[PDB]
Ligand binder design. Structure first.
Ligand SMILES: *[C@@H]1O[C@H](CO)[C@@H](O)[C@H](O)[C@H]1NC(C)=O
Ligand SMILES: *[C@@H]1O[C@H](CO)[C@@H](O)[C@H](O)[C@H]1NC(C)=O
Ligand SMILES: *[C@@H]1O[C@H](CO)[C@@H](O)[C@H](O)[C@H]1NC(C)=O
Ligand SMILES: *[C@@H]1O[C@H](CO)[C@@H](O)[C@H](O)[C@H]1NC(C)=O
Ligand SMILES: [Ca+2]
Ligand SMILES: [Ca+2]
Ligand SMILES: [Ca+2]
Ligand SMILES: [Ca+2]
Ligand SMILES: [Mn+2]
Ligand SMILES: [Mn+2]
Ligand SMILES: [Mn+2]
Ligand SMILES: [Mn+2]
Lengths: 236, 236, 234, 236
């Protein structure tokens, strides 16, 4: 049946079906630390992609793929606040971190402009919204749908819980071009949701790579960006 | 792998793998009308269950099942308002509509009391909250998590859209006992979400039947309760 | 995606999603004994509780399906009767009046009536010409279409008390039905394929399951299925 | 649920999730020609692997994976006979064609010795058994289970049909270490089967790449080695 379906209940150090870029890696406890967690802390940018590209749309038949993904993640800050955030994304097949990318752009963008050549769709869990540094951001931690730009086309207030596990379910229904983000914290019932219209055929190439990215722009306001598990399915 | 998984992209008149109770039926256009839609309007109560019971928990091993379900539905009211609502539920294997049930109880309850003998867990999409007849309801249309009672243990404001298709994803994660309801309207981006803790092993018997139920208590304030598609998976 | 997909790694006593007919039941050890184990003559069938749409009359589409199961046939002596079968019958079908162990509770007679609407894969242990004149001269795997007299058979190298793994696939576009049997204990393998048009034999809605029989208490054997996987898609 | 599951109903020219080695490629008609079809004909060796490695066993837990795969293929010879054959295999992650490999070794082996360092398990559909060049082969076209050597640990007569489509189902049940090969020709009912005991944990590394390989050692006895579709699943 379905074109593709994979599931990681846990990660293993030096997992061969995951492409690690930047500081991303998996600890001995089995968690994907997309951002570096080290004794003397430090600035960091990392991305982790599934090793095989996925056909998101077909130019022959014109068909677009519907997909669903689920993952659990933890963002633990030392103080009461941290930077910069985590993102789930779709980019051109075997994409590399752009030259001159920063933590605030999650290793996804070279700048704050909206270039159609970026060919990136991402769901961000943005923890830093400082106005002189991230002027494009709203005045609160948020969940945003990014389409070719770090300046989200739509955002929603994210009630982040320090050190608590968040369960996320993202669905893309091709026939209606609807992208829905479902987030909940089992520990206390906190839930956030956001949906937006996005035509994948219009933004991305036929073959894409999916994964996570994140960054810590200021070592003094450190936080982790750990993903505990990951499920993904797609079908044309 | 997984214990059970079924998918209905559409329904067919007199579908043999669906048990119809009350006024529930599937039209020639392939939609499950859990509530009766007729030239001259009338009061109605209906339920539709998947024909085979599902083991939600094992008494031998003590294991509890995790499940996920997705469905799209439409509630179209003649005037600007309608009654009474729709519900997705889990009940004892091959459960029948209780004697003396009403539209306001969605054919799930005999009364407004919280009896542990009911053994019912349901997610309701309640359109009628009139304090004269439904005193247990909040002052707005809502999504509620019902556990052995029509008086929800938790509700959230439901931004119902007249005649628009709503996509719903319900997930139950056994290890954390977390039940999450994710609703969105692709037509305009409206999204509602709610999460609650529920121990299935404590409320339901080992074998249950899953399905939809609904009711129209006042023909003068008529509305449809149509489910367009349905996906379901469970695993112990 | 796929219309239906279920999996039983083990069975549980009085499983609610299985319809038991005749002497079929599940033991406390979690195995489906389609035939009664205790001794006496027996006939039993076990069906999945929900019907399955095998073909659509609107679109004309036919469903492709795959199933996998493991079973054991343990005889007391060096031989036993009568066999086990995997089948597709009309939705919520009952055991026919006057059925016998040699017909696995699937047929009223040895005639080929199109009204039977039955397709079955049999693992036939008894081929005595006295009671089963339609059978070949050896234990076999047969593809039955509306009759106990198989349209095609193949020698079955049955192993007493050993677990057999079976994979049955039906590829609708080519109308091909393949039966794949193997004994992990010693490598013994048997295979058979035949052309069958489901749309021509069965109604839109069918019930799937197992059936079996022990026609002679003196030549007793079990007909136990240990696990079961099934998928179908239109 | 399941670790991995992919399905190709057809192939597309320059498919990004398939690694092509040697002469392997996919035609405009959507078929994977692991061997070159040029006419002007020529000698050829080709391999096609799924782009992402698969974890076949875990050294931490000791668990071994069970897997199932299905594919349809055609071997069309110009004359009444052709060479050399096709193979489905599991090799070390991102394995390359060995230096000095030949068509009779399907681009899998450097020699006819049984080296444990080869770390290869393959199911071959061998069309050439000439004792002059393939002395290790039996006296008929066959299906063989290869474990670290081109000299099969077990074979069975293969009733090859020129130009007809063959459906193959290969299952590996970890608990019993049983590998079963199920082949059938829908056109005439011809069926062949073979099973053998193989401990994956003992032969292969934790991470492996799966795919097809084939060869045409003599351009004068040309034949195609086309795979039409491919399904694969694995679970630890
Ligand atoms: C932005 O990133 C792209 C990709 O690496 C690169 O080609 C471009 O030069 C970058 N812009 C700058 C100013 O570095
Ligand atoms: C309420 O429902 C229960 C279950 O069907 C039934 O036993 C009880 O008698 C009902 N109450 C009335 C008044 O019928
Ligand atoms: C054979 O079985 C069918 C179905 O139960 C029944 O209608 C028929 O009368 C049976 N024949 C006899 C002789 O009982
Ligand atoms: C055989 O293949 C291996 C792998 O490429 C290589 O290391 C070796 O040198 C080759 N030749 C011989 C003679 O083994
Ligand atoms: Ca930011
Ligand atoms: Ca109400
Ligand atoms: Ca017989
Ligand atoms: Ca050879
Ligand atoms: Mn932002
Ligand atoms: Mn309510
Ligand atoms: Mn027979
Ligand atoms: Mn050989």
């Amino acid at each position: 049946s379905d074109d593709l379906s994979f599931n990681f209940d846990k990660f293993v150090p030096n997992q061969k079906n995951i492409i690690f870029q930047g500081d991303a890696s998996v600890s001995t406890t089995g968690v994907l630390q997309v951002t570096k967690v080290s004794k003397p802390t430090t600035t960091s940018i990392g991305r982790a992609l599934y090793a095989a590209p996925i056909q998101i749309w077909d130019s022959i038949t014109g068909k677009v793929a519907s997909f669903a993904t689920s993952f659990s993640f933890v963002v633990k800050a030392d103080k009461s606040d941290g930077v910069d955030g985590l993102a789930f994304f779709l980019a051109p097949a075997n994409s590399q971190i752009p030259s001159g990318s920063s933590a605030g752009m999650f290793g996804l963008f070279s700048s704050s402009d909206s270039k159609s050549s970026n060919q990136i769709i991402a769901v961000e869990f943005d923890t830093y919204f400082g106005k002189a540094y991230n002027p494009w951001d709203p005045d609160f931690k948020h969940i945003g749908i990014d389409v070719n730009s770090i300046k989200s086309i739509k955002t929603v207030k994210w009630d982040w819980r320090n050190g608590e596990v968040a369960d996320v379910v993202i669905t893309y229904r091709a026939p209606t071009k609807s992208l829905t983000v479902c987030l909940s914290y089992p520990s206390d019932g906190t839930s956030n949701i956001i949906t937006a219209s996005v035509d994948l055929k219009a933004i991305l190439p036929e073959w894409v790579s999916v994964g996570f990215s994140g960054g810590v722009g200021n070592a003094a306001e450190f936080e982790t960006h750990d993903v505990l598990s990951w499920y993904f399915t797609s079908n044309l």
